[PDB]
Write a protein that binds this ligand. Sequence first.
Ligand SMILES: OC[C@H]1O[C@H](O[C@H]2O[C@H](CO)[C@@H](O)[C@H](O)[C@H]2O)[C@H](O)[C@@H](O)[C@@H]1O
Ligand SMILES: OC[C@H]1O[C@H](O[C@H]2O[C@H](CO)[C@@H](O)[C@H](O)[C@H]2O)[C@H](O)[C@@H](O)[C@@H]1O
Ligand SMILES: [Co+2]
Ligand SMILES: [Co+2]
Lengths: 270, 270
Amino acid sequence: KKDIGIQLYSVRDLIGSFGRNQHDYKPVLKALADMGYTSIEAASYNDGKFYGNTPEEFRRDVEAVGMKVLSSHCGKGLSDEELASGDFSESMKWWDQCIAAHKAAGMEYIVTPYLPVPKTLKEMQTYCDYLNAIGKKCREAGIKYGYHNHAHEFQKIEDKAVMLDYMIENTDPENLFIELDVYWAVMGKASPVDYFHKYPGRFKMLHIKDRREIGQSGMVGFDAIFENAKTAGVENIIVEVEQYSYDVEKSVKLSLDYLLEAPFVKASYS
Amino acid sequence: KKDIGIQLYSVRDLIGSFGRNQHDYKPVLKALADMGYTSIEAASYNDGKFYGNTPEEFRRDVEAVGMKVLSSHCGKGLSDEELASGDFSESMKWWDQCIAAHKAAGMEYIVTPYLPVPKTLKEMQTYCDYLNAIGKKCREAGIKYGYHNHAHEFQKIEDKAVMLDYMIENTDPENLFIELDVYWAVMGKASPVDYFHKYPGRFKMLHIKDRREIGQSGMVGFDAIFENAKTAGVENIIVEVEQYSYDVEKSVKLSLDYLLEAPFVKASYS
Ligand SMILES: OC[C@H]1O[C@H](O[C@H]2O[C@H](CO)[C@@H](O)[C@H](O)[C@H]2O)[C@H](O)[C@@H](O)[C@@H]1O
Ligand SMILES: OC[C@H]1O[C@H](O[C@H]2O[C@H](CO)[C@@H](O)[C@H](O)[C@H]2O)[C@H](O)[C@@H](O)[C@@H]1O
Ligand SMILES: [Co+2]
Ligand SMILES: [Co+2]
């Protein structure tokens, strides 16, 4: 028995329409709980709702199968108009609702899943200003706000700063943590462990991702990652699987079983 | 106790000119044996000699410390005329001497460390014709011939075939195996295990390589690699370390110790 979360994007293909119900997620929640997942990270936020349902209902649904509502992927990248103007006010109204709805759903974290590589350092600084502003609102509501990488964040901006480094260096630790995706880091030619040592404590969650099933490919050194989790600052780990060798359910079950069997994965990080 | 080899390029900084010897390697051979390495892969072949010594003397020196002379990195590239013509006969005289020198040194394998990405599929095919002929000569002398990748072989030729794939497909299994560098495969965005399953039996040796010390970075999934070593065809594993967190001897010892402590690394593959 270990505390391990699942990103619901992983089962996007198993959440469809049934009767009048447009996002019929309850069946897959029960299947995931049955496998042994202990918490979820959502991937469907809009207009104060999750999967088209009230925060309160969604929370009840997740809790009914014995899992925790832990985190969510959502956000609102800046328009070209906002990058040039610096006026985020319309964006910040959206964040007020978003944060309130996440608190209502019982979330401990909110994570933005994607920002594009900016053309200039000036733009990157505007992004840092935005990220700090959002993180500050989150902390006032008692939520931790973070950012999830792909591989493009390991590119340099204007041949100077690496994008992810700049983000980390120019955000306050209480406003922003990094939900490090260890597969995309490797695909970016980055060493997760070298990142952990460079920015101790900033990696409060990990996305445990591989090419397909966790621990199958030979491309990610989970042993070394987990050996360095304390330095990193890990509180929670979330499995993510987007490509599959088997039917989706089996793929995500085998991924969980890799971590459950691994002696280097602790029973809890929180 | 496990059978684990060491690429002597790893300790190039510890083999200097000193005294009577242009390459004073005996002290480091003894340090490597004392650490627990069982075999060596050379990286200094020239005109019938190893590290400036006769094959017979080099072998005596390696065997005196209880290690095996296993493998060697060497190879002669084609001229522009030979590449355009497909006439290797000049190059094949070099190979007769090379093969004989390696057999005298007790070598089981000879591995070519580098070919550049060819401009055309015609050029690549000529290279495959060359690799086949070398490997046939090696085989007739009792030696297994192989090729060691970096990241560039995961590039496409003429936006068609991937270079490493084309090489494997167009060489006979008994003439050529791949000494797969697992770190450079990952840097090339390739899955070692997916390569193993695509080309079963062709990976007779592995280069066990990481960014620095083996198993430190988080960038290589050694557990998955070793779990699939039978499909792959692994017979021997060779450590390589080229960048170091510590003094060279400690870095290569820590690298060995990771493998000795890893339960998924068997005592022998041969
Ligand atoms: O050591 C040579 C490289 O140094 C930098 O890259 C390292 O540090 C970056 C920031 O932490 C990482 O993104 C990267 O993965 C590291 O290798 C430098 O930015 C590179 O240009 C050099 O290759
Ligand atoms: O998944 C589609 C891709 O297929 C090829 O790439 C895969 O196969 C290559 C040959 O074995 C590997 O080098 C590579 O790592 C694999 O991802 C194809 O070359 C790609 O263009 C496709 O996107
Ligand atoms: Co992810
Ligand atoms: Co190598």
